[PDB]
Amino acid sequence: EELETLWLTGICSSQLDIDNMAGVFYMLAAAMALSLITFIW
Amino acid sequence: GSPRHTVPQCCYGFCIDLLIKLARTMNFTYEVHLVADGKFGTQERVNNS
Amino acid sequence: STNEGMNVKKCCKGFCIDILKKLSRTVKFTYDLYLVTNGKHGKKVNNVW
Amino acid sequence: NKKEWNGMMGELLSGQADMIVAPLTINNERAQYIEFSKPFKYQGLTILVKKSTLWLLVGLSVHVVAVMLYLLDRFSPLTLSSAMWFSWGVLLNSGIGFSARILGMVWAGFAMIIVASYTANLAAFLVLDRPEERITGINDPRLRNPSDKFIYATVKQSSVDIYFRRQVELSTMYRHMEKHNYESAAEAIQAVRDNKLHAFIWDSAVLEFEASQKCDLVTTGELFFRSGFGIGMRKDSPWKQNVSLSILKSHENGFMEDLDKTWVRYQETLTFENMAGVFMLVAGGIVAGIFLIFIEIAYK
Amino acid sequence: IIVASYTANLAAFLVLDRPEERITGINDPRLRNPSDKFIYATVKQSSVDI
Amino acid sequence: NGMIGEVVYQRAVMAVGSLTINEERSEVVDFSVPFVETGISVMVSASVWVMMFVMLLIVSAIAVFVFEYFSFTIGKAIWLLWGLVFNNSVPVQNPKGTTSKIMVSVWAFFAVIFLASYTANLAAFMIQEEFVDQVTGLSDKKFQRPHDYSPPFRFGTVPNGSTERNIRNNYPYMHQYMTRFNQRGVEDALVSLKTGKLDAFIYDAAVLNYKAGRDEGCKLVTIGSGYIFATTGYGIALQKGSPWKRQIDLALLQFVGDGEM
Amino acid sequence: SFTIGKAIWLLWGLVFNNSVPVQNPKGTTSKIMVSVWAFFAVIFLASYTANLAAFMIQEEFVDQVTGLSDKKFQRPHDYSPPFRFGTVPNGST
Numbered sequence: 001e002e003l004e005t006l007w008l009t010g011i012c013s014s015q016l017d018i019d020n021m022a023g024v025f026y027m028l029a030a031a032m033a034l035s036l037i038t039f040i041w
Numbered sequence: 042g043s044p045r046h047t048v049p050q051c052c053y054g055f056c057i058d059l060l061i062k063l064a065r066t067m068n069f070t071y072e073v074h075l076v077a078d079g080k081f082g083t084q085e086r087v088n089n090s
Numbered sequence: 091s092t093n094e095g096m097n098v099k100k101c102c103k104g105f106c107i108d109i110l111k112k113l114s115r116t117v118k119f120t121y122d123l124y125l126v127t128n129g130k131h132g133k134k135v136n137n138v139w
Numbered sequence: 140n141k142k143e144w145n146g147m148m149g150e151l152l153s154g155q156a157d158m159i160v161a162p163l164t165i166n167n168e169r170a171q172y173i174e175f176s177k178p179f180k181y182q183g184l185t186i187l188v189k190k191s192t193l194w195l196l197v198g199l200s201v202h203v204v205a206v207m208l209y210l211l212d213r214f215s216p217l218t219l220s221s222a223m224w225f226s227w228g229v230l231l232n233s234g235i236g237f238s239a240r241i242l243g244m245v246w247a248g249f250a251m252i253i254v255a256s257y258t259a260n261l262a263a264f265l266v267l268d269r270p271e272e273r274i275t276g277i278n279d280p281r282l283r284n285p286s287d288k289f290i291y292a293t294v295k296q297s298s299v300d301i302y303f304r305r306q307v308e309l310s311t312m313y314r315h316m317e318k319h320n321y322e323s324a325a326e327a328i329q330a331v332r333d334n335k336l337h338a339f340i341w342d343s344a345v346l347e348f349e350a351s352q353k354c355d356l357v358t359t360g361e362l363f364f365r366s367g368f369g370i371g372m373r374k375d376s377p378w379k380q381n382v383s384l385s386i387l388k389s390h391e392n393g394f395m396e397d398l399d400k401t402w403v404r405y406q407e408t409l410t411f412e413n414m415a416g417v418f419m420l421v422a423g424g425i426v427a428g429i430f431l432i433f434i435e436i437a438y439k
Numbered sequence: 440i441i442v443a444s445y446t447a448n449l450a451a452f453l454v455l456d457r458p459e460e461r462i463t464g465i466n467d468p469r470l471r472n473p474s475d476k477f478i479y480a481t482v483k484q485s486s487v488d489i
Numbered sequence: 490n491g492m493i494g495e496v497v498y499q500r501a502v503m504a505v506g507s508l509t510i511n512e513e514r515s516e517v518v519d520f521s522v523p524f525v526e527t528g529i530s531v532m533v534s535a536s537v538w539v540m541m542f543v544m545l546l547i548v549s550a551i552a553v554f555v556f557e558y559f560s561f562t563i564g565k566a567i568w569l570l571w572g573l574v575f576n577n578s579v580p581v582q583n584p585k586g587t588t589s590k591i592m593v594s595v596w597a598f599f600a601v602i603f604l605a606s607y608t609a610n611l612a613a614f615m616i617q618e619e620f621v622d623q624v625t626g627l628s629d630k631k632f633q634r635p636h637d638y639s640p641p642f643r644f645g646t647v648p649n650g651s652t653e654r655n656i657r658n659n660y661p662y663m664h665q666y667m668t669r670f671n672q673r674g675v676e677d678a679l680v681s682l683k684t685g686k687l688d689a690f691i692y693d694a695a696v697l698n699y700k701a702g703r704d705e706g707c708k709l710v711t712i713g714s715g716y717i718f719a720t721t722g723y724g725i726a727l728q729k730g731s732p733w734k735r736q737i738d739l740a741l742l743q744f745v746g747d748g749e750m
Numbered sequence: 751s752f753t754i755g756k757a758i759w760l761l762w763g764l765v766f767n768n769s770v771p772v773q774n775p776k777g778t779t780s781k782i783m784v785s786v787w788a789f790f791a792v793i794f795l796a797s798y799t800a801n802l803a804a805f806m807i808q809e810e811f812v813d814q815v816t817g818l819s820d821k822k823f824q825r826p827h828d829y830s831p832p833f834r835f836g837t838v839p840n841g842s843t
């Protein structure tokens with residue numbers, strides 16, 4: 001283990017997440033679809 | 042706890058299937074039996090000698 | 091032109107080198123470490139290693 | 140093919156000198172040939188280092204929301220500018236005096252998700268915007284296996300150079316530091332001052348005095364090879380015993396601490412950086428808005 | 440400013456600070472000089488004990 | 490007495506145990522080079538607001554210009570403005586000015602990003618964790634008189650030690666104030682600091698660093714790193730004129746120079 | 751007074767407080783209890799900001815291919831993006 005420690009040693013933007021925000025855009029699309037449902041009736 | 046009660050039971054698992062693979066590959070019958078204690082085994086001074 | 095070559099002395103270090111040095115200091119032998127000429131590890135090239 | 144000793148040991152062993160009074164880095168090699176005293180300073184080694192689309196997307200989004208709300212305003216089961224700036228004020232949380240209520244509900248929840256995501260963005264960038272180029276480690280594999288960008292060396296033919304020549308595996312460093320060895324320490328301070336030296340190995344309290352010179356002159360926190368600055372001497376010589384006794388006599392009282400008060404102890408995110416250019420760009424936007432307002436005055 | 444400081448130090452209270460629930464193996468000082476607190480052991484007469 | 494008495498009177502050869510290096514010991518024995526840095530120690534337990542005010546008066550002047558063009562929002566615009574800096578939903582005024590509505594929109598965007606940046610400043614103030622102290626070494630003005638402050642604090646050493654000789658050759662009056670504080674054991678003073686029966690404890694630096702580096706609780710805090718202190722080392726004492734000095738002095742520097750120390 | 755069915759959207763806007771036009775009631779009852787509920791809303795927004803502040807603690811992006819068991823390595827043309835995989839020649843692998 002000492003030799004393994006000696007010779008084998010290694011480590012370890014405003015557009016962050018379009019995925020979850022795009023899911024909220026899917027919620028927005030569901031909202032405008034429900035607005036169209038209330039619109040036609 | 043139990044000084045004299047030894048029964049045949051049913052063994053299965055990892056090394057059981059490994060031994061089954063060995064007995065299917067290599068021509069030998071076998072006899073699985075458990076160990077009398079719950080230890081791997083260490084070298085320690087016995088009473089005599 | 092010829093397959094003759096010089097045996098240039100070079101310096102080995104690393105992990106297995108330390109393993110070989112500690113094996114030499116424990117088993118207490120001597121050795122003449124050298125490098126391969128053919129290339130990689132090995133292959134049974136039509137019943138020829 | 141004869142060994143030689145240059146430098147202050149060259150002028151001492153030739154008889155031209157009598158006593159080395161200097162920041163003498165005590166090592167084993169110089170101890171094999173001359174004799175020392177007990178060190179006046181205890182001092183190690185250290186390193187001197189130096190110190191978008193979604194906005195326009197949300198704009199197009201509030202444009203589409205204003206379009207569909209004004210289509211609800213026309214197809215009801217300056218009203219145009221009032222409804223548009225009603226949507227803008229819902230977006231900007233200030234300055235406002237039935238499916239439109241549902242759409243404004245969804246848009247206001249969306250804008251609160253926007254400001255919460257910006258809160259997450261600033262909370263991420265107040266931690267992740269910290270340089271890993273500030274290594275602060277001799278045991279870094281970036282130092283063990285050197286990169287051509289990280290420029291580290293020391294004074295050419297120093298005691299630290301000999302100590303790195305001796306070290307157990309650092310011939311990789313010893314054949315890497317040969318590309319940037321310097322003669323004088325002042326040229327090393329000038330070269331790290333020009334941001335050329337990404338690292339520089341030197342004795343601790345020297346760079347700790349040089350830490351307060353300029354605010355970017357930063358020393359690392361690791362303390363390795365705890366050596367001593369002492370007074371260099373000859374061989375067996377009558378200036379060996381009582382001189383070391385007088386040094387330790389200076390150590391027992393505060394005279395060494397007086398000498399520390401002369402030079403050693405003596406030295407020589409916020410609301411500005413995140414807001415200065417923002418405030419100036421907002422002021423320029425106010426001026427351009429005033430120009431567009433005078434255009435609106437000349438409209439009517 | 441009070442509710443902003445409250446939000447900030449509650450985020451401090453639930454995000455940053457955390458006790459070391461693990462031991463990190465051989466690098467625990469509380470196993471170097473042990474006590475009745477960290478009860479560490481192994482199987483009696485095992486190769487780990489060897 | 491002790492190790493010095495065993496070395497001087499030639500009943501032994503060398504002392505390898507922990508031992509400080511001062512003047513009279515160096516008179517009576519020969520020391521090696523020190524290998525560990527061991528001193529002594531004491532153990533105990535606005536222009537942003539200005540430019541915001543300027544732009545506030547700029548915005549109020551533009552609202553005055555709105556009142557000049559196109560109605561009680563003369564001084565009330567300041568109240569609406571700094572209310573919507575923070576967006577407290579305060580009933581203030583209904584801005585009828587089109588210029589005023591656009592200016593309120595731009596200012597509210599600026600107010601949102603300003604409060605967001607202030608939350609960033611709150612987290613930045615939160616991440617930094619400082620460690621304030623009370624005594625900054627032996628040069629503390631508490632040590633000049635314990636009655637200068639109202640509770641008489643307790644500073645102590647170990648008996649018959651080299652630290653006592655270093656104090657009694659610095660200030661015998663400090664020894665006179667310490668005379669009522671002479672305690673016996675090192676762990677006795679450890680328990681006395683962990684309970685409250687002791688305020689300060691003057692001792693060697695490295696031993697207190699070893700005790701605090703393994704202490705369950707980390708309540709006891711060192712003072713610096715030996716800055717205003719004795720600043721010496723632990724060597725290996727030898728006999729007067731011993732031949733072993735050169736080999737030990739080379740070997741300790743080798744032990745430093747290979748990283749084995 | 752028209753806030754019979756409009757009280758849902760009104761209480762929504764009193765939860766979130768995004769400059770929603772609010773028909774303010776003349777009754778102390780809803781004033782006190784919607785003050786308590788909007789206090790809950792404010793501390794809920796504080797908790798949601800702390801949730802998004804805890805969102806940046808972790809640092810881990812998952813792998814693309816789990817290993818040899820993938821049918822990408824079994825068949826490369828069945829998958830539309832082309833990828834390449836290599837070894838060393840004449841080796842044990």
Ligand SMILES: *[C@@H]1O[C@H](CO)[C@@H](O)[C@H](O)[C@H]1NC(C)=O
Nearest residue numbers: 063064065066067068069070
């Ligand atoms: C095993 O060996 C015996 C004789 O050694 C042979 O008769 C038998 O057929 C073998 N069985 C298998 C499964 O190879």
Ligand SMILES: *[C@@H]1O[C@H](CO)[C@@H](O)[C@H](O)[C@H]1NC(C)=O
Nearest residue numbers: 084085086087088089090484
């Ligand atoms: C054998 O050794 C064990 C261990 O000390 C002891 O307890 C036991 O009494 C011994 N047996 C006899 C017969 O004395």
Ligand SMILES: *[C@@H]1O[C@H](CO)[C@@H](O)[C@H](O)[C@H]1NC(C)=O
Nearest residue numbers: 376377378379380381382384
């Ligand atoms: C060193 O000091 C001692 C006593 O102080 C004195 O006897 C001796 O002569 C001194 N030696 C030299 C070389 O000054």
Ligand SMILES: *[C@@H]1O[C@H](CO)[C@@H](O)[C@H](O)[C@H]1NC(C)=O
Nearest residue numbers: 647648649650671672673674
């Ligand atoms: C300190 O020295 C005195 C003087 O001889 C002695 O009586 C005492 O036993 C010593 N030890 C202590 C106080 O622990």
Ligand SMILES: *[C@@H]1O[C@H](CO)[C@@H](O)[C@H](O)[C@H]1NC(C)=O
Nearest residue numbers: 128129130135838839840841
């Ligand atoms: C692999 O083996 C073949 C066999 O002839 C040889 O031609 C080739 O050069 C080898 N490749 C290597 C060693 O990289």
